[PDB]
UniProtKB/TrEMBL annotation, chains A, B, C, D:
InterPro entries: SBP (IPR006059). The keyword DNA-binding does not apply. GO terms for molecular function: putrescine binding; spermidine binding. It comes from the Bacteria. GO terms for cellular component: outer membrane-bounded periplasmic space. GO terms for biological process: putrescine transport. (R)-malate binds at G186, A187, R207. Keywords: Periplasm, Signal. This is ABC transporter substrate-binding protein.
Length: 322, 322, 322, 322
């Protein structure tokens, strides 16, 4: 009869979670997991927790929000001695407030019709409209976008942080007159590649993979990709705290975690998933957080984005868009 | 292996569809159903279909949109000779472009803590601030909201259309100083009830149901509720038209339809679902479209809302809210 | 050696507090009271409390903020059995989070040079530029301003709430072309009366009293004044909670409280102050919260201003100012 | 009974002035000193004096403003034959329009938790992110900030003026990606140190002192601090000119001046205060303007900052921050 409410970003992503993680976890614990979905949980987290009576227990959200939340007292400090699967993960994969749930990438996607050979392969390529002609799109948001701009200006993937925001914006202003559209949704970013409105764009790898698999002649590279993650955390005042903690342990179980990539092109939060032999070699080669793919990417710094510099960067975005 | 992309509104609702309709249909047809989610599909549908190469095949959307969509050539005129389960539904449950999928209600919800006995039971009660004191919320949108205002003014549920828009707005302007919050999302509306910020509000019955299951001392009545529906349609140019047509038939199969209420508090688009003996009597009595429940409610006129009068009413809403 | 940090709005007000309340309290408890000042404490309260380590213990702020703070979990719930002076105040003068500290009024001030006889005496007078010619100023803020606009439109002082905000703004738009300036600071509002730039304005009674006493031929009426208050509260995570609680008890001691009006034209938060015979009859006649003065005024509803309707009213202000 | 209105910056600082200077001066002169507070007096001074009827008499303000004010005819040219305590101060401590009131510093403050030993001890250290890792803040303002940047670049404290503005900005642009927060108020700067959001920052020494007294494990050094002052001046047209002139004389009486450091960590405007034996040796050694402490610091040039070059430097700051 025990119960929690679990919230993620919906779509193929949440359906994939349901098959690999939510349903096997509910069945194993003997609980009911009520689901919700929201594109961006942060403002609702603040309102819910502030009231003292949030309707949500467990939130799957980009890791920076968990950190910001913990730092502002909105998120439960986790007692890891009650979450052995997470405690057995390496320290880099968790915070005092959260545990890595899955890895995704913002990548340079492109048209194989425009580029059957010699595709753009880095942000320096993306910025060079002369050497690589074609319509382009970036996300209407500074996250990952600033990192790409800095890499286009020659910064090494492992020397980005703390971001030189002034420098990133100058670089973005430079490319602006060559950006056909600044997308606001994943589906939009997929449609832009599918109908050939752009020849290249930054996109989430899951969106690119899905449209490719549907038949679109598009692809992407992990080279200079921006490697990101969502994490699970528990809201302060969660009405089902004790049950939520038990669920957290199952949600990062290696075998459950290993099953996620069987249903969607995202890597397991828990790297022990690769030890289960659930993920076949071919499949593993496609995932954002497979060692060789991860080594090609900039690892997003959630310390930087959760800090005041991240907030300030976001405030400058609105100003930038004109 | 044939496939389609199916789009709905995510959350508990899309999870419930997956268990009852999507997975069994996919298994039965031997296909893959890729899912996506979006709050409002209309704008993307225009863009996708106008490109001639949409990424979505089948959309689940409030029935009114299907009507406007079909007229404007954004969705397929269906051939019901190929969709026998739909063809056998009464004509009132379908259009030339769509089929009723699911029924939900906008209802008067209220705190049982505040109203242990003698709860408000109609929009007349909701407008009666001296008899029923307390904090109140309405949705920041004209749909259902205008009908409630007319019923508040004594119009009978079965005599609403065509709506006397002037009269609705007049009643609305009268309650306005007494509205605590004009909510904008389902989740917000549930949180408002859960944390006691409002003692009564219009809300979707599914949201109220879910909060009450979590343990909140709240309830609602179907009396003077506004009975609404979503329908399934196929994008014009859908890349998997044939498979999509076959899925629709499975989507409104009476047994699949009957399983939906087992997982969420919405009524089946196909009334034949009540004859399957799948739903328990006690559970049936809780559904928006159960006959006894439907009889207390206003049946939304999608013909009126999709007409020029409906458009003009939406355009006024902006002026009203500010 | 015990210590607290106490924060108020500075100026003559804080100097007056220091003589009547802070210094006698520090001396009686044997503690050190470190002082700070801020025009509007709310944003800093959120940042400080959110960090878990606020530098402030006790905040004197308009009562609505204490309520909003308590409702959002930023402010300590007071254990009144440890604050006998406050527990002995009537329930209407405290909340679960705060205790009334002092009363002030927004009043209709005017020039005795322009109006040596038949001065404007209500908001209806203020809005009638024909019957009462002269330059006018209001505050650049909706607080008290909306209440006055509604009273000018004929609403009774005791029938304002919940505010009909639409109606208040229409009324404010009507007077707008006749407002010479919308003041942003108390000192500015005093200077406007002193140099005759306006003949009448809404102003805080303390500002008007001070400039009058300095020699300016100005006065004001309490008729249709807006009666307001600040309250003391303790921030969650206060580094000196226990000492802060002890201080709270002394800060609303009747005799200390009775001394405040000897140094500034504001009424005691604790009405028992009038029982001490510290405040002379003549002096008492000048105070915002003396029974006869209070009876002439609209009593500001902090329930209304601390609620979402208050926030929405504030958001409309920015839009209004053009 | 004669009176004046005295204006300063409120907070602990104005409270400390009241005990040490205002109350004793009022008692000695047999007058009433009405107080006001404002963060920045300049704009109001222009308005008040331009009306010919200011409400303020005596203003306490950063010395640079006095110079510009006097030149533009906003404040009285003082007659020092009537202010003997001022006349006997060295000429460097006064202008024709003002007298040094109090000395404060902008200092390198830092966490002792983060730096138990080997704390940063100069702006060179502050700029040295590899040797001294940690979060950092600077004030969002060019004053003191530019000097720190020049010292960071190796300029000696006594060789700063006229400032090489280009070089300052170049150094500033270099540290910029490493600045966590650009603070805007003293209180914010104290909170940042107190809650560990920064491990080092420029801050006013009074703010750091106060936070350290509260128990925070923080400190600062006078090394390469920027030594600054406020002065007293009288508004042109002051309604109580004669009384104001008499107050100034009492305000810089050596004994009154010597009492100020007993209540706050600022140095006396009148150096003769050190000869009164009022201040304890250990306490003197903590003051910004103690000789040994002054010798480690840059003495702000109010002549430079008030010049056209200074104005031009302020105008560039806006361009730099965005």
């Amino acid at each position: 009869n025990a119960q929690i409410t679990f919230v993620s970003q919906g779509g193929a992503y949440q359906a994939a979670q349901t098959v690999a993680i939510l349903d096997p976890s509910a069945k194993k614990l003997g609980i009911t997991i009520n689901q919700d979905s929201i594109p961006d949980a942060w403002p609702a987290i603040k309102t819910q927790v502030g009231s003292g009576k949030p309707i949500w227990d467990v939130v799957d959200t980009p890791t920076g929000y968990c950190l910001r939340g913990g730092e502002q007292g909105l998120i439960e400090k986790l007692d890891f001695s009650k979450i052995p699967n997470a405690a057995a993960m390496p320290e880099a994969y968790r915070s005092p407030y959260s545990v890595s749930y899955e890895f995704y990438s913002s990548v340079l996607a492109y048209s194989q019709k425009t580029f059957p050979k010699d595709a753009p392969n880095s942000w320096v390529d993306f910025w060079d409209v002369k050497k690589f002609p074609g319509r382009r799109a970036l996300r209407n948001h500074p996250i990952a976008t600033l990192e790409a701009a800095l890499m286009a200006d020659g910064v090494a993937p492992d020397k980005l942080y703390p971001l030189d925001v002034d420098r990133a914006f100058k670089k973005l202003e430079e490319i602006k007159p060559h950006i056909t559209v600044w997308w606001t949704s994943g589906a939009q970013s997929a449609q832009l590649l599918n109908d050939g409105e752009v020849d290249m764009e930054m996109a989430w790898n899951g969106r690119v993979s899905a449209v490719a698999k549907e038949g679109a002649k598009v692809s992407f590279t992990y080279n200079q990709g921006i490697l990101q993650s969502t994490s699970l955390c528990i809201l302060k005042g969660a009405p089902n705290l004790e049950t939520a903690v038990k669920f957290l342990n199952e949600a990062v179980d290696p075998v459950h975690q290993a099953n996620l990539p069987l249903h969607i092109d995202y890597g397991p939060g828990n790297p022990k998933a690769f030890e289960t032999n659930v993920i076949k070699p071919e499949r593993a080669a496609q995932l954002p957080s497979e060692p060789a793919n991860a080594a090609k990417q900039a690892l997003m710094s959630y310390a930087w984005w959760s800090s005041p510099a991240g907030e300030a960067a976001e405030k400058r975005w609105a100003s930038f868009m004109q």
